[PDB]
């Protein structure tokens, strides 16, 4: 109830970047969202059925099924204050590390919607290597999707952060984690995005979806 | 004066939103509309490349092949002022005449901030009428990236930031005859948001080198 967890999986990084080599030896790496790890602020999920409708499948359904502490809600202040010039030079990148007390394989869903329409389907299936009593299941510097450096790249044409804060508003991500085996869902976090509001630095809050 | 080659003109162009309202009564909102003695405007057709598609079968390529007096660019203050909340009919209307009785090739390219989303082909053909030939399309379906792409639109609270996303967004026709491959017009589109009251406007230029 601190953080990215249910009994059986953790999050303990997620990052999406771009990095710039300046040099031979020399690289920026600029974080576009961060997490990195008192109780968790809740929200009633109720709240967000209107920014995930969906029906079959759709979030309203996965956390009937349960179990209820799997379900968290992410919110994403984006720093997009970074040079998109030189593509050549460029790589946009996503790395992340979960944890888990018992060796699975699991699935990852990650579903793109924009302005009610899904846009994106990704599933993976991922496998754990035992370390220091756990197992843990990392990505490292794996490309950022098409869609998505296409879309960093249209927000930033738009001359005011209020308009790309407009666009955001109809734009969701829902990941589901679950057990290849047992399809126990492990994870499901719903993600919602707006712009940071700072000249430089990323910022989230999590929260923990109930129904009560 | 006016979008013309030698061998093929635009008399007509039109996208349109027609809701049914009862059996006999329907409205028609037309999004854009073309129907037609001064000089067209000069725009230097390097200044579009980049908003066009590139490469092997580009804009450039097609200009160089030529002829140069086939080349035009469209801007539409496109009327977005209509509900879009069943049933409802998107439409496309066009009318082209020649002084020869061609096969003609229609190729539209959507290009969104870069890239090619969308690529349509169709053949069109003739009907003789007085000593010359007419080609029309007639309410054909407006394709559904189009009609997703204007509900996004009215989604915005802005018509400036609707107008900000359009700055990034490309439509290219290629008519071509079929047999010969010559092209017979090549018609960049741009778009802007027509203001309130406004309706559909268009201004049209010559593409030059
Ligand atoms: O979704 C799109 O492709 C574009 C758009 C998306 C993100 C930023 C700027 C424009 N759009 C169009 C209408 C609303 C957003």
């Given at each position: 109830?601190?953080?990215?967890?249910?009994?059986?999986?953790?999050?303990?990084?997620?990052?999406?970047?771009?990095?710039?080599?300046?040099?031979?030896?020399?690289?920026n790496k600029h974080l576009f969202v961060h997490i990195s790890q008192?109780?968790?602020?809740?929200?009633?999920?109720?709240?967000?059925?209107?920014?995930?409708?969906?029906?079959?499948?759709?979030?309203?359904?996965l956390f009937e099924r349960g179990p209820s502490n799997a379900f968290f809600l992410v919110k994403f202040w984006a720093d997009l204050?970074?040079?998109?010039?030189?593509?050549?030079?460029?790589?946009?990148?996503?790395?992340?590390?979960?944890?888990?007390?018992?060796?699975?394989?699991?699935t990852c869903s990650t579903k793109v919607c924009s302005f009610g329409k899904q846009v994106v389907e990704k599933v993976e299936?991922?496998?754990?290597?035992?370390?220091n009593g756990h197992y843990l299941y990392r990505i490292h510097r794996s490309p950022l999707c098409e869609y998505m450096i296409?879309?960093?790249?249209?927000?930033?044409?738009?001359?005011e952060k209020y308009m790309m804060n407009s666009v955001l508003e109809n734009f969701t991500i829902l990941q589901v984690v679950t057990n290849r085996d047992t399809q126990e869902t492990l994870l499901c976090i719903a993600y919602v995005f707006e712009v940071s509001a700072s000249e430089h630095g990323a910022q989230h809050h999590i929260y923990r979806l109930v129904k009560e």
């Amino acid at each position: 109830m601190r953080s990215i967890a249910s009994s059986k999986l953790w999050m303990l990084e997620f990052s999406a970047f771009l990095e710039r080599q300046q040099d031979p030896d020399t690289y920026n790496k600029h974080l576009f969202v961060h997490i990195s790890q008192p109780y968790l602020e809740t929200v009633d999920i109720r709240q967000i059925y209107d920014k995930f409708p969906e029906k079959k499948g759709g979030l309203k359904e996965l956390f009937e099924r349960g179990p209820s502490n799997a379900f968290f809600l992410v919110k994403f202040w984006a720093d997009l204050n970074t040079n998109i010039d030189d593509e050549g030079s460029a790589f946009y990148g996503v790395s992340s590390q979960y944890e888990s007390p018992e060796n699975m394989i699991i699935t990852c869903s990650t579903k793109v919607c924009s302005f009610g329409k899904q846009v994106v389907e990704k599933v993976e299936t991922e496998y754990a290597r035992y370390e220091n009593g756990h197992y843990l299941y990392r990505i490292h510097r794996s490309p950022l999707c098409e869609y998505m450096i296409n879309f960093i790249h249209k927000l930033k044409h738009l001359p005011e952060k209020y308009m790309m804060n407009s666009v955001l508003e109809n734009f969701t991500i829902l990941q589901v984690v679950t057990n290849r085996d047992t399809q126990e869902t492990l994870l499901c976090i719903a993600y919602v995005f707006e712009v940071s509001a700072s000249e430089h630095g990323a910022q989230h809050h999590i929260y923990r979806l109930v129904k009560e």
